């Protein structure tokens, strides 16, 4: 009797097993991508950063943008580590914006829930906005599993 089994499929695949965060463009320019990092690697690393994403118009960049001259090859970068939270690192030639407020380039910032990054500032019609989606599931694993001292 697989009566219960049928219910298991109801919940479907649980998101947040490795997928750190997801970037979604609100202005409709760049295709939504999924950023992820392995938990084992994060827990194993007790120094420096674990995994960082590079975004821009470059096909190398962990994030492929549309084609904005105002933006650089790797306009912005996202780093995950420290303790468990997320960090946002701007790396554009023109600058990276957060909700209209320009942040310090190549600087680490505490990520925000459903936050948004604006880029290509200079001309009213040459600005592009992006949205960062973070899953609480990922945070649950980190909290449920503390580094060192196993219970």
């Amino acid at each position: 009797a697989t009566q219960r089994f049928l219910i298991e499929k109801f919940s479907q695949e649980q998101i947040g097993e490795n997928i750190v965060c997801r970037v979604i463009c609100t202005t409709g320019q760049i295709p939504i991508r999924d950023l992820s990092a392995d938990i084992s690697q994060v827990l194993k690393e007790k120094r420096s950063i674990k995994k960082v994403w590079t975004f821009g118009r470059n096909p190398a960049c962990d994030y492929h943008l549309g084609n904005i001259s105002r933006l650089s090859n790797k306009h912005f970068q996202i780093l995950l580590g420290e303790d468990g939270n997320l960090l946002l690192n701007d790396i554009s030639t023109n600058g990276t914006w957060l909700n209209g407020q320009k942040v310090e380039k190549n600087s680490n910032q505490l990520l925000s829930q459903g936050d948004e990054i604006t880029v290509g500032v200079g001309v009213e019609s040459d600005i592009l906005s992006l949205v960062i989606f973070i899953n609480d599931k990922f945070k649950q694993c980190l909290e449920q599993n503390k580094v060192d001292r196993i219970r």
């Binding site: 933006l71 023109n94 200079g122």
Partner: peptide, 13 residues
């Protein structure tokens, strides 16, 4: 040579 720029960086520092 003569071509168009790639990344128009706003004059600033």
């Amino acid at each position: 040579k003569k071509m168009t720029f790639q990344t128009p960086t706003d004059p600033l520092e």
